[PDB]
Amino acid sequence: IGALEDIREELTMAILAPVRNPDQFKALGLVTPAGVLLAGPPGCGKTLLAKAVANESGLNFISVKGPELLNMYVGESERAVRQVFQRAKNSAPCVIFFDEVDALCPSVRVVNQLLTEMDGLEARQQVFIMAATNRPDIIDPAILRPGRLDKTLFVGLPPPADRLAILKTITKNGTKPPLDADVNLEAIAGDLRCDCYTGADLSALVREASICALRQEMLKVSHKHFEEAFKKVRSSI
């Protein structure tokens, strides 16, 4: 275990522990932060581990792409910010992922609306931010100040436990793609060639195996597919 176990603990202490033990939580002087910052090179599985942790805890997940939110310059951007926080509150417990939070926080007012909405959040509301960047030294240190995205989590090469978690999310626990009984994800995650794997190679491993399964038909994903997929992992990471 590596980054998975860290992301797991930060969610429980902001969406499970404060609701389940309010008198104990508020007695230790604990205050839920708006979110966490995921930092590391792209393709390491920041998004997949965020979705993995939400799933296993029975939480909702709402994504936001940093460059996509520049739809209406200053305009509908702030209204979208406001809607994503609103959407998350109606579908609580929910996690609001700000993918590529950098360069969105390098408009000088959307940072204030992001800080507004983050400061506007309470533990009762059961909403947890997860932001992602490849360069934390470039983001606004305002969004990183205590109460906001105060705990930074570094995501590097996933250890064997993070790989099975990533695989249980990509395959949606062997339902999308549907896996047959001969496929043991725990054996795939612990494989020799997976020890150097990024989140992207795991993501490509499932695609390639699924592509094999769709290519043969021209439905389930077999160990044979995963075997042929390892010979085809030409992931950009």
Swiss-Prot record:
Biological process, per Gene Ontology: positive regulation of protein binding; positive regulation of telomere maintenance; regulation of protein localization to nucleolus; ribosomal large subunit biogenesis; ribosome biogenesis; rRNA processing; telomerase holoenzyme complex assembly
In its UniProt record, a GO molecular function of this protein is: ATP hydrolysis activity
Instruction: Name the UniProt key words of this record, in alphabetical order.
Output: Acetylation, ATP-binding, Isopeptide bond, Nucleotide-binding, Nucleus, Phosphoprotein, Repeat, Ribosome biogenesis, Ubl conjugation
Regarding tissue, the record states: Widely expressed. Highest level of expression in heart, placenta, skeletal muscle, pancreas and retina.
What is one term from the GO cellular component aspect held by the record? nucleoplasm
Residues reported to bind ATP:
40-47
Subunit structure and binding partners: Interacts with NCL/nucleolin. Isoform 1 and isoform 2 interact with TERT and isoform 1 exhibits a higher binding affinity for TERT compared to isoform 2. Isoform 1 interacts with MTREX in an ATP-dependent manner; the interaction is required to associate NVL with nuclear RNA exosome. Isoform 1 interacts with RPL5 in an ATP-dependent manner. Interacts with WDR74 (through WDR repeats); the interaction is independent of RNA or pre-60S ribosome particles.
Protein family per UniProt: Belongs to the AAA ATPase family.
Function comment: Participates in the assembly of the telomerase holoenzyme and effecting of telomerase activity via its interaction with TERT. Involved in both early and late stages of the pre-rRNA processing pathways. Spatiotemporally regulates 60S ribosomal subunit biogenesis in the nucleolus. Catalyzes the release of specific assembly factors, such as WDR74, from pre-60S ribosomal particles through the ATPase activity.
Name of protein? Nuclear valosin-containing protein-like
The uppermost taxa in this organism's lineage are:
Eukaryota, Metazoa, Chordata, Craniata, Vertebrata
Gene this chain is encoded by:
NVL
